Each structure stands twice: as C-alpha cells, then as structure tokens.
Symmetry: D2
Subunit: 178 residues, 4 copies
Amino acid sequence: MTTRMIILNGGSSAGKSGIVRCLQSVLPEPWLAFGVDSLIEAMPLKMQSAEGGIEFDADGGVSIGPEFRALEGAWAEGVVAMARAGARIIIDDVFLGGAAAQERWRSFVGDLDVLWVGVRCDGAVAEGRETARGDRVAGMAAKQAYVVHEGVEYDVEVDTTHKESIECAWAIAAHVVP
Amino acid sequence: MTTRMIILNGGSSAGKSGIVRCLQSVLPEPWLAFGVDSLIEAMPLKMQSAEGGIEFDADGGVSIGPEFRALEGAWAEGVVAMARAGARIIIDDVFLGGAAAQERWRSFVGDLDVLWVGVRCDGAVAEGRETARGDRVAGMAAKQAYVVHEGVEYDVEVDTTHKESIECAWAIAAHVVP
Amino acid sequence: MTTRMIILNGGSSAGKSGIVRCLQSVLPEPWLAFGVDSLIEAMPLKMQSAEGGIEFDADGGVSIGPEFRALEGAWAEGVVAMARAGARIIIDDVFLGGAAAQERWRSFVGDLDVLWVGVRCDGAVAEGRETARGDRVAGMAAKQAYVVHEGVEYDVEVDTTHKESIECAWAIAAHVVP
Amino acid sequence: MTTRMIILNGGSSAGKSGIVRCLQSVLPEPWLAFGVDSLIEAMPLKMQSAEGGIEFDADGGVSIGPEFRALEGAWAEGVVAMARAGARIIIDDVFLGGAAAQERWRSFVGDLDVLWVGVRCDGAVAEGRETARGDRVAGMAAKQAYVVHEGVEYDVEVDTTHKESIECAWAIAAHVVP
Ligand SMILES: O=C(N[C@H](CO)[C@H](O)c1ccc([N+](=O)[O-])cc1)C(Cl)Cl
Ligand SMILES: O=C(N[C@H](CO)[C@H](O)c1ccc([N+](=O)[O-])cc1)C(Cl)Cl
Ligand SMILES: O=C(N[C@H](CO)[C@H](O)c1ccc([N+](=O)[O-])cc1)C(Cl)Cl
Ligand SMILES: O=C(N[C@H](CO)[C@H](O)c1ccc([N+](=O)[O-])cc1)C(Cl)Cl
Ligand SMILES: O=C(N[C@H](CO)[C@H](O)c1ccc([N+](=O)[O-])cc1)C(Cl)Cl
Ligand SMILES: O=C(N[C@H](CO)[C@H](O)c1ccc([N+](=O)[O-])cc1)C(Cl)Cl
Ligand SMILES: O=C(N[C@H](CO)[C@H](O)c1ccc([N+](=O)[O-])cc1)C(Cl)Cl
Ligand SMILES: O=C(N[C@H](CO)[C@H](O)c1ccc([N+](=O)[O-])cc1)C(Cl)Cl
Ligand SMILES: [Mg+2]
Ligand SMILES: [Mg+2]
Ligand SMILES: [Mg+2]
Ligand SMILES: [Mg+2]
C-alpha cells in the first residue's frame, strides 16, 4: 500500500529534476532524490572516458559500457536497500533501453511498492529547453524524447509540454499512498 | 539603427536567463551577457551582509544600500563602454525600483541604441518555477512579478507564462537591428 | 582482506573532497563517492529549515535533529548495501559527534572491511581555505578542525596542512587492499 | 598613487581564484572581480566551438581565434572604464601569450594605476590540484605553469606551491595603495 519508491523516467530536458524538487517540497514526509545525474557525479571522472564507461557523443548520443552497468547495478541495489530501511526514495532516470531498462529496475525492486512515473515532452520543445539551460550537449533532448518510453509501463504520466513542474508534481503526489 | 544593447527586465524566475542563453544561440553575431546575478557574483561575498550592501530577507525581500549602488553604477558605465567599444551586450536585470530603475539605466546609456525588453510571467507560475529550480529564496518570484514593471517602457514584451524561452527569444531577435 | 569501503572523516575545508577526487583518479578500480554533502543535496531543501532537520547557524555551527538522523541512517544502510553488492565505496563525512559518530558507522558497516581515514588540518589554515573557496559559512572550519577527531580511531591519518591532496591520496591508496 | 586595478596572472590551478576571494575579504573597500573565466561565462556558449573562438584541446591546450580576441578587447576597455568610473577592479587572467599578453593589457590600461601580480606554482603541484578539483581538462596546469610568465613584469610575485591563498592575499594587499 504505502508507496516506498517513486521512479521517474523521461528524456533529457523533459523536466524531471524540476518535478523532483517540486515533489520534495509538496510531499509532507522527507523524500530522498537520486538519479542518473547524481550517480555520474558520484562515479570517478574517468568513467566518462573509459571504454566500458559512459561516452557522450558530440551530437547528443550516449553509450553505456559494462563497467558503467556493473556499478549502476550495485548502486541500484543500495537505493532499494535504503527504501527497505525506511527511507522514501525518488529516482530520476533515463531509460535509454526502453522496456529493457524498466525490466532491469523491476529486477532490483522486487516486491517493493513503487510508483512508476512517465515524464513526457515534445522533442522540439525539449530541444529548446536544452538550449535555454546552457548545460547540456545539444542533441540529447531530441534523441531521447520518444525512444525512452517505448514499451514502458507507467502508473502516472505527465507531460511538461504545456504543464508547469509544480503542476505535474501535484498530479504525481496524488498517486502517492502515505 | 544597429542595436548595441539589449536590456531585459523581469522578476525572479520569470525566465530571463533562459531567454538570454537562447538569444546568444540564435543571434548570428556574438553577444556578451551580464546581469544583476553576474554582478553579485563579481562583488565581494561580504557585500551580502553589509549595511549598505544587498540583503536577502528570509521571505524573499531584497534591499539595496548605497554601497551596492555606487558599485553598480561604475559597473553600468563599464558595460556601456564595452558597447561603445563594439561589443554587443545583453543585460539581464530586475528593476526593483520600477521606472526609477529604467531612468538610472537611461542615465548611463545616453544616446546608445538600446532594445528595451520586458519579460513577464504570472506570479503564481513564477513561484512554482522558483520551487522547481531549488536555487532561490522562496518568496522572490511572487514579490517581483508585477512591481518590477510599473511605469517601465519597453520596445518588446514577451510573457513566459505560456511561451517557451526559445520562442520568446525568436520574438526578441526579430526586433534586433543588425 | 579486500577493502570494500574507505571512510574519510575531517572538519570542513580540511580537504576531503579534493582527496576523494584524487583517490578516484589514482585507484585502478572504479570507486563511487558519497558524503554528507551529496546526502544533503539529495535531501529535500526544506530539511534545512526543519526543527529536527539540519540547521546552519550564522556563525558556523551545525545542528542535526532526529528527522535528519533517521534519514541518514537509512542512507547509511543503503551505502553499505551497495558495498556488499560489489561497489567500491568512498565516504566523505564529518563526525560532529566524534567517537559516537564512528560508532554509529560501525553499527551499519558490520563485518564489512573498511579503511578508516582521518583527514586533519590546522584550524587557522582551514579557516583561510574556507575564505578562499567562497562557498561555506564562515566559522565551520575553525569549529570542526579538532572536535571531530576526538576519540576516533583511524587506519590512516593524513594532514593537509602541508601536504597536497594528491599526496594524501597516495598515502591512502597504499593502504587499500585490492 | 591609489591603486585602481589589480591584475593577476598565472597558469590554471595556480590558485588565482582562491587568492581573489581572499583579497575581496581582506581589502576594506569593495573590489569587483572579473577574469578570463567570468568572460567565457558571459560569452555565447557557441564561442567554444567556433573557428575563431576558443578551443579546448583534449590534452589541455587552449587556442584563441580573432573572434574571441575582438570581444575580449571590447570587454577589456569596459573593465578599465569601470575603474576610471571609480570601481576597484581585480582581474584574474592567464597570459597564454606571455609578455605579448601583458602588452595588450598595458594598451587598454593607459596611465591607470595598476598592481601587476604574478601567481606562480610548480607544474606538478598545479597538476595535482587540477586532479583534485575535478573541474578542469587534465593537462592545462602543466602546460601553463611556466610559459605564461615568460617576459612578464610584476610588482608582486607570490608562489602558492607552499603558501596558502590567504597568505598570498596578505602579501598582495600590503602593496595596495588606498
Ligand atoms: O583507468 C582506466 N581504464 C581501465 C582500462 O584501461 C579500467 O578497467 C577502468 C575504466 C573506467 C573506470 N572508472 O570509472 O573508474 C575505472 C577503471 C582509464 Cl579511465 Cl584511464
Ligand atoms: O548530461 C548528462 N546526462 C544526461 C541525462 O541528464 C544524458 O542524456 C544521459 C542519459 C542517460 C544516461 N543513462 O541512464 O545511462 C546517462 C546520461 C550528465 Cl553529463 Cl549530467
Ligand atoms: O567590511 C565591512 N564593512 C564596512 C563597514 O563596517 C564597509 O564600508 C563595506 C561594506 C560592504 C563591502 N563590500 O561589498 O566589499 C565593502 C565594505 C563588513 Cl562587510 Cl564586515
Ligand atoms: O537570487 C539572487 N538574485 C535575485 C535575482 O536573480 C533577487 O531577486 C534580486 C533582485 C534584484 C536585485 N537588484 O537588482 O538589486 C538583486 C537580487 C542572487 Cl543571490 Cl543570485
Ligand atoms: O514540512 C515541514 N515540517 C514538518 C513539521 O512541521 C515535518 O515533519 C518535516 C521536517 C523536515 C522534512 N524534510 O526534510 O523533508 C520533512 C518533514 C517544514 Cl520543513 Cl515546513
Ligand atoms: O556546507 C555544508 N556542509 C558542511 C560540511 O561540508 C558542514 O560543516 C556540515 C558538517 C557536518 C554535517 N553532518 O555530518 O551532520 C553536515 C554539514 C553543506 Cl550546506 Cl554543503
Ligand atoms: O555561428 C557560428 N559561426 C560563425 C561562422 O560560421 C560566426 O561568425 C561566429 C563564431 C562564434 C561566435 N560567438 O561566440 O557567438 C559568434 C559567431 C558557429 Cl558557432 Cl555555429
Ligand atoms: O577551464 C577554463 N579556463 C582555463 C583557465 O581558467 C584555461 O586554462 C584557459 C586559459 C587561458 C584562456 N585565455 O586567456 O585565453 C582561456 C582559458 C574555462 Cl572553460 Cl572555465
Ligand atoms: Mg534530471
Ligand atoms: Mg536571470
Ligand atoms: Mg567534502
Ligand atoms: Mg581563476
């Protein structure tokens, strides 16, 4: 019943982070937020130039090797362990592998009660937001806007194309069982 | 004829910075961007706790003393001097003093050709964006959303309430004389 | 035998973060880094103004309530779980409660093989570094420089007062069993 | 007599920024700080991928085209204009072109009273600091540690190899005529 984890998925610049900060502000109980971004931050800088690490193409492409995956896996188990320990966890991710990515998460989550959230945004609009924020390799937003959701199942879907972050947060919070 | 300076004015979280980065990306010639934020960054940290410096109330209020103003003034003259020297300058400001603030700028600009831009956004929406970005004292957006424009004259007015940054940028760029 | 976790402890501005980035660069296998700072980053912003959250006095003091501790605890278990899952983890912390803080960690770590590192630095020197970095409430460095180590047991002790970060990293890496 | 501008020069990771923040804290009157870094921040993002812009080699090299120089020039005149207007200005730069770079500055400064400061640091030590800060293309520190000072004349020289930032700041402040 009680929601233990909220997992958001969406392409770059779709507005996930904004929603996450809004959720932490809205939800009455403290929710810890982690994502692919905080993970990369925690990983050694050299992981970004390693063969089986993560590579950012000059055109927005993203490649993930086995070195990166092995680490992500251990990190995923720890996040889930935090939840089982009683910490409310929000996860901000980008399912580059679509359904396969969701399956991987299901693999670690087990029978833990999770709220699967889909965060959509039109590719062109996301691209514009990408330009507006100045901190992102041009090309990611467009490349991830749709592929990332293929075959993925959600409990709640919000679209930031015409909805503010705080509004999407309200929509998501209503599905969070205390 | 040729536009030398573009001066944007709007309350916190109205979307100025995003527009500025979009303008720099859109406009063919290189435009340098400076604002009240880069200025505070360049000022000594202690200016933020000084009597006549700048004080950020715990509720979003902002007070500016004479120490801060004297410095801002010299900085304003330098920015204008950069323009007269041939650098295209975009300025991102918050006219806390409404029309009085614009007059001060007119004072430094002289006969330099400037494009005065107004950046509006509904207070409640800006407040939500304030929460979404996690980096801003709650209360500023609402407090500045309207007062900042009172008696101020613009050449172009854009509203981010329902327009993306890149779109407002297109509207502004069209008024920029090469 | 194989070192699973490296736990650094030291006052603010003692140089922990620099050492951590050096360790990640030096150590051949990928090491994930988390600390009290990344934790606060992951916690809701409001935790910083909550009764039992974390409060930063205007003079450098730091208070931690039960709300903050409960969360930290669940986070600690997750970090350890990441280690047991095979991820090499570096932790950057500040034992405000001296020995009591180390005991708490021992509580979560169990029989996991950990490398306890002490990072010292003269109070006055740390204070200067605090001023130099511009991002830290004046007063923390001096307040934490010594109290934080009282009754704490280390496997390796480095002092940044006259040693570069990369050098302290070499000293620490030598004690890391592959 | 009265010092109007303080111009620091030194290779990447030599410790300039730290010194600058210390100077702003130490000096009684408010000093505005600008540098090659704040300039790049103010320049359009695309300047970093333009033919005559600025290019960061994957090995630490830095190339500056005419597009970048033209803008820098106008910016230099504005900074000086700020000084003539009464603002105390600290400048943090990297004289890639050695003496030629200093001549260029002399060109804009004119008869303005300037305090020329040299900030040295051993290449290997700077390289280590480069690794420690995680935010800098590996290779810059070593490449700039010496070449940057060739044929350059200073009023004060400090060396961060064995001196803290706050200490170098004290040495520099003593040469500042009120
Ligand atoms: O250390 C490195 N590589 C080897 C293989 O040459 C390695 O197995 C590795 C790759 C990435 C990584 N990380 O993220 O810390 C760690 C080790 C390169 Cl990053 Cl220099
Ligand atoms: O820009 C970055 N990451 C974006 C997402 O924020 C990139 O689009 C990305 C997408 C997926 C990913 N992953 O899950 O493997 C990693 C990075 C990091 Cl360098 Cl901050
Ligand atoms: O130095 C200070 N104050 C005096 C008056 O006590 C001063 O005239 C002043 C205020 C702000 C400032 N600044 O921004 O650098 C400089 C000096 C305080 Cl910030 Cl400690
Ligand atoms: O949050 C900040 N500034 C905002 C504007 O970005 C604040 O609303 C503000 C408004 C006006 C101002 N001024 O022009 O005097 C200074 C700060 C700085 Cl601390 Cl980054
Ligand atoms: O929501 C809040 N407080 C209550 C008590 O009034 C609460 O139990 C709490 C405190 C901190 C916190 N956090 O970090 O998310 C969460 C809830 C205040 Cl932060 Cl407004
Ligand atoms: O400045 C901050 N934290 C410093 C340590 O980096 C503060 O000294 C501190 C010390 C101990 C602590 N804790 O473990 O409870 C939290 C913050 C955060 Cl706001 Cl980034
Ligand atoms: O706009 C661009 N280039 C042309 C030449 O193709 C131009 O003259 C230029 C280069 C850098 C720049 N800047 O920094 O804004 C501006 C224009 C490229 Cl950055 Cl896409
Ligand atoms: O890393 C950067 N700049 C460093 C100096 O901080 C680089 O070494 C550099 C050196 C000289 C320069 N210039 O003056 O032309 C520009 C960048 C910027 Cl991307 Cl923040
Ligand atoms: Mg995100
Ligand atoms: Mg702005
Ligand atoms: Mg640290
Ligand atoms: Mg610098």
